[PDB]
Design a protein around this ligand. Structure first.
Ligand code: NA
Ligand code: NA
Ligand code: NA
Ligand code: NA
Ligand code: NA
Ligand code: NA
Lengths: 148, 144
């Protein structure tokens, strides 16, 4: 399991960034028997089925037409954002999300660490905002289920 | 919209029958916020979402990858289309897996007093039009 900390973003960074637009959305609500999620990852499209009272995750790749026909059934349970991949001066990789639609102006930065004490030793750079690693509200599903 | 009566089948009929194999299953349980169903209709494959209704055609590989997540909520059967001597069209389903030996015959009528006047032929069994147990989702959700 990866080790990571997540922060608000105080200032968008300069430097080398790779941008990927992302759109992801739930067809189901958390109390359903299964979780069915649609995602677009750049140029490819997937539908994922998970069941915890199922074995146990299924993923099918779908085409753009299948995706856009079903997308409207995700309304109100969606996260759309552009994700920027970069690297801090010390070499830690980061992923910086700039959220679209009603989640604007949220921006989040997530950092991955190789030792789970490089993680505890981490000194955030000044462009990072407040840490939200523990805040339940900033988890992906929480963000998708929040409302305008 | 259409008028129909449904019966058990006492004797499989002779005569001209067209056969279509069918497999259809629910990814969801009736208490879910949506209904998501997978169906194979002979040579083509669909996923349907109801809450609005959405239908997407899928290919065989998409279908057979998701099919296992319908286990316990499925109906598999061969449907035969025919016509009674008086011309009423019928659909006769021969169920597979644990629903065997069930066979059902459904008849459609143009007027509701053709429906009320209908005299079933001897090969039909007891009528189940009103039995909730023989409805499609009820059949899908019943268990071995
Ligand atoms: Na939402
Ligand atoms: Na906003
Ligand atoms: Na800061
Ligand atoms: Na069943
Ligand atoms: Na049986
Ligand atoms: Na009879």
């Amino acid at each position: 399991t990866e080790i990571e900390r997540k922060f608000l973003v105080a200032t968008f960074p300069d430097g080398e960034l790779h941008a990927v637009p992302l759109r992801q959305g739930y067809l189901t609500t958390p109390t359903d028997s299964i979780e069915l999620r649609l995602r677009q990852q750049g140029t490819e499209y997937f539908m994922t089925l998970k069941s915890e009272g199922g074995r146990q995750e299924y993923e099918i790749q779908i085409d753009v037409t299948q995706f856009e026909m079903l997308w409207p059934a995700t309304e109100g349970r969606r996260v759309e954002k552009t994700r920027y991949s970069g690297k801090l001066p010390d070499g830690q990789l980061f992923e910086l999300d700039v959220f679209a639609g009603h989640l604007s102006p949220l921006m989040l930065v997530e950092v991955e660490f190789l030792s789970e004490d490089a993680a505890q030793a981490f000194i955030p750079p000044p462009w990072f905002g407040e840490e939200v690693t523990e805040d339940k509200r900033y988890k992906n599903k929480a963000l998708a289920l929040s409302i305008p």
